Symmetry: D2
């Protein structure tokens, strides 16, 4: 079967591996290697114990065989033997000897076409950048929207961002049915790994500020990314993100001008229908009075909160939740599974 | 020289009293009484020691006469003697004896014209409900917008909500310059006194949930209230509020459809000129990369973050911060000071 | 079976019901009624969605049959039909007709022997007060330490507190092995339901204070409680609790003077042996560097953290974790199960 | 007079410069230079805007005179002109040219005697290491305890840690009056800048875990530092630190065995008397029902909470609060002032 490697064993990388074991349906590929600059004992500890998603429900054993380090991981009636590497320079990875079909690049540091190619140079056949593109990519994929357009020549694929995987379906479903003149996105997002505990020097002066204390407005990569998947939306959408002191789960607030008559009732019926048919793999809709923690560990790319839909004149707002870690992780698995042979 | 009383000595009431002392402008009226169901010792302790605004910078003496109880408060070279009451039923209050010109109704429990009138029965001349009207009021006021529309005959007045006091200026300023077809508000708000520590039974199933752990979408009274202050915008505005785990300070995100040509530059230029002329009392504008904490203890009704301004087609989004406790409290005092002859 | 009822469907009562459903081994008694002052739609909503313990992994359907309200709950191959009451006065509850064998008193309001006897008046055969004794009880019980002391004639039983169910085993084990001259406890505890979101009037001026913003030292009922369970330890142990901004899980820091030679090694070995033999049902020991969230949803009364153990001379500190909600709730069900068996 | 420089403009460096402006006492020395790896704009931003201590009540102007960058700072009727540097390696700094009497080494990185001497190599006469010693120092000083013991020839001084400056007075006073056989310390501490936002690789597997979600036991440097100030206490004292989700302020809980008769009353009288005489510069005592936020921006090294004092037999516990940032910063300024003699 396909052989996947993970580069960067962080929030995303770890959750990717966890989600593999937890999936109700076994995936027709294996994760055979991981790479991080941190040492193996640190990685196994963080893999096993998570403040957000709880204890890994399984067993992990470190072995040294030849001069190589492996994890033997057993859970949910599955076992993976996974080689562990510690190489800060992607070009030096052994992807050639490990026969790596797909690298998931989850470090945040190799988003450029050139940087991503280092894995190719190392002998991997395909990279998925687990982030919005920086400059160029062969393809920008949202699973469940355009994963069928991947061609065998697409070697550098971006799986965009949590935010994009939620925004893109909403925009598409709604634009397809009612037509969107323009739209503006407000995201309300849990804290991220790159924020600060206390006020501290940082590249961004807002993300420098104490994350547990502040409401922090910041930029979002999701708009640039959406425009690469839907170029027709150029100059028709913008937005930003707001970090707030929760550990996980985010929401998108999308405000649009419709090109045809809208009611709350019709918007919701459209989204329900979308969720039951074409987008059932990735989208749910709820009518219950729920809050962020209710969607922690949810595998959906988005869960529309139909109770928040509002219309005034031609202007509407819709609202969807997502687990920004578990949704994304599951979509990386789904995406890999879609490559088939 | 008017005589103000405060009913409900909570986040708003205490802050009103503090703001009187801390104001660089000395007000003409005196605060001469306060009432709460809690005893004076609890009241003075919470007045002195505040988790949000810090230690009160002054001296509080409690005096027990045969009958009456008084605080003697000294700070910033000002002195008040303040009778303290403990009467749950506002009709039984001795406002007649005390010659109360204005009661500030800060309990959250007496917003109906009926309930507000309990203070008129107890002997007060005028009541300012410190919230959105529940049904009828002689006037709904946003200081710095329609405070002159108060008639010397008006007895039951509403100072609406913090949210309203920020929404209305924005909507007014933008409607007057560009025209607003429709607008939709997203408020991102610190937790409030009525929320829950842990998941607990509550009249509102969203506010029942742990306030420190969750992003919580909920209703805003601001929209109902804005209709009263500006009935020309009936059915043109809607919105909601999101609670997040910060202790204080909020932001409004207003997305509108303009009726004439707009750019980021033009919108900002207008908001700047407004803050420098007609609205300099209640409004500021910044371009510095700030976050919620930086507005704690700010007395402004709103501070526009101009770097957040966005335009797509006929649609735009503006963003303003406000201290939901300190701005409102200052606006109550400003309102009381407007009644002066 | 035996027939249990829960009085007060809060953090404890709701977790008791959940724990009934989640226990790997099925309990051989049924929960047949719950009572609370909140309406049934609020109860069912909070039972299904939990900020701390996640979604209930099952289905709940409300039915009206006669004039009676029922919950039909399905989870883990198990079914209960549970009558819902809403009676603020326990003497008025229909325990006679429901043939209640045990009431779990989980409101915090009926801890006195008199208050608790009201359930007996209503026709229940036995009450467990899910709190420290207020004045008198027939028995004060720590499951796993002295639950075999319950007499057939005992009708008002205290299951003490979470803190007590952790402290008592620790003291008993160390005292039996090395002897305790004296000991002092510091508990670090997540926020509880009776605290405040913002600074607010309260009967206790420390629990008045914003629970998300502060370290708040307060009293504990566990020292009084331990005295009832182990009278020899009168005048030998004291302590207190600190509330900190986490949502669940606590720790005991116990400092004791030993009456015989001690080392870190010998203390940890003892605690381990105890957890593997006599205390296996309620006690675990870990050697890994774990934090509070790693014990969320743990059913143990205590998990000793052997990395924390310190000795200087004759003085020693031990440290144990517990899920204050889930442990206690499991112990309630274990206690009920003990009467049957 | 005397010329100070700050190496590292973080929580400590920044608060030292703020504390300089805010001190009621005007200090007989000037801060004439700061160095950080971050650019001047970030530094000035973080000096002006603080999530913990609020906005600097003053003005800062950046000028470029020659090719040198300077901050013109004005606050509290006082002025400084501070050169800004951006050198990653201390030996390169221009201390000789600038005529630096004392460098405050606040990076956390140059705590070895060797790394510290790099500043003396750079032309500084004296370094204070603003942290516990790594290997050797000429003197480990707790201001208000042993600062008289600095020799004019001492060149590499440690001002220990925040925790050390609260613990040492407590230990000394109690040991002096009553004799301490042994003692154990539990510190309850706000989060610190080296902690994690989310679960992230870290040298310390505990400090790896999400800082806003968890109670986190970890090591304290204070025991090693205290044994350098009081070698007699070797083998007689140990302890640790628990990090909890607050932004600032900590407490020490000291459990000790007394060598002579003790009561609560006598321990409290002692600590009170100490605070009023020989420790009046650094120590206070309160019996008010206060919480962490009430000691934010307190300049004391420790504030004893006398209500927390417990005695059982020969064992006692005391409790003291401190602002871990603002206390230490003031003690740094106080130590520099002591060198004028
Ligand atoms: N977390 C989310 O909600 C979310 C959602 C969508 C996309 N993303 C993206 O995922 C990426 C990673 O974010 P995260 O939250 O997992 O962050 P993280 O900081 O938890 O992960 C970074 C990891 O990479 C490792 N690493 C750093 N440099 C390395 C190198 N040179 N070689 C190998 N390993 C290296 C680090 O040790 C760490 O384990 C970012 O690009 C982020 O935008 C995150
Ligand atoms: N907090 C904000 O940011 C904000 C801003 C604008 C308006 N408001 C409004 O201000 C009002 C009060 O809100 P708050 O945040 O001060 O709440 P709070 O809970 O802090 O204040 C309520 C106070 O009223 C007292 N009280 C209760 N019953 C009483 C009675 N029968 N008689 C007298 N006092 C009684 C309570 O003891 C308490 O001190 C509400 O209408 C709220 O919507 C709040
Ligand atoms: N939560 C813990 O960590 C913990 C652990 C051990 C013991 N306890 C004890 O258990 C008790 C309950 O605390 P909790 O955390 O579940 O609190 P909670 O506030 O979550 O639960 C109280 C519940 O009782 C209901 N109630 C109120 N009045 C009632 C009445 N007259 N009749 C029936 N129901 C009524 C409330 O509506 C609410 O559902 C307290 O005595 C507490 O000290 C709590
Ligand atoms: N904050 C506290 O509560 C406290 C109290 C006592 C002691 N300390 C100790 O003080 C030290 C620093 O702590 P902090 O909280 O101020 O940390 P911080 O991380 O907030 O500040 C460190 C600063 O040093 C700068 N820096 C890094 N490398 C540098 C270099 N080579 N040259 C110049 N600047 C450099 C960083 O950019 C940053 O501004 C640590 O040893 C800490 O343990 C902290």
């Amino acid at each position: 079967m396909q052989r996947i490697a993970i580069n960067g064993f962080g929030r995303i990388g770890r959750n990717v591996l966890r989600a593999w074991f937890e999936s109700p349906k076994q995936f027709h590929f294996e994760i055979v290697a991981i790479n991080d600059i941190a040492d193996v004992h640190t990685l196994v500890h963080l893999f096993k114990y998570d403040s957000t998603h709880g204890r890994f429900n399984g067993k992990v054993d470190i072995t040294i065989e030849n001069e190589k380090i492996y994890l033997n991981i057993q859970s949910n009636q599955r076992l993976l033997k996974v080689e562990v590497l510690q190489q800060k320079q992607p070009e030096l990875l052994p992807w050639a000897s490990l026969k790596i079909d797909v690298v998931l690049e989850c470090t945040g540091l190799f988003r450029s076409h050139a940087d991503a190619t280092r894995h190719l140079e190392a002998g991997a056949k395909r990279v998925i950048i687990g982030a919005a593109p920086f400059d160029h990519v062969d393809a920008a994929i949202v699973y469940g929207v355009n994963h069928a357009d991947v061609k065998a020549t697409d070697q550098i694929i971006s799986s965009v961002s949590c935010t994009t995987q939620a925004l893109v379906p909403l925009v598409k479903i709604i634009d397809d049915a009612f037509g969107i003149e323009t739209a503006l996105m407000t995201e309300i997002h849990a804290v991220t790994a790159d924020q600060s505990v206390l006020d501290h020097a940082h590249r961004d002066l807002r993300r420098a500020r104490a994350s547990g204390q502040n409401i922090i407005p910041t930029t979002s990569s999701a708009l640039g990314a959406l425009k690469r998947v839907m170029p027709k939306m150029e100059d028709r959408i913008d937005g930003y993100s707001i970090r707030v002191p929760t550990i996980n789960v985010a929401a998108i607030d999308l405000t649009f001008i419709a090109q045809s008559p809208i009611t709350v009732h019709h918007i919701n019926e459209l989204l329900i229908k979308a969720s039951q048919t074409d987008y059932a793999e990735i989208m749910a809709v709820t009518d219950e009075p729920l809050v962020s923690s209710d969607f922690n560990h949810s595998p959906y790319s988005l869960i529309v909160d139909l109770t928040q839909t509002m219309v005034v004149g031609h202007q509407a707002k819709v609202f969807a939740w997502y687990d920004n870690e578990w949704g994304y992780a599951n979509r990386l698995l789904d995406l890999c599974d879609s490559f088939k042979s």
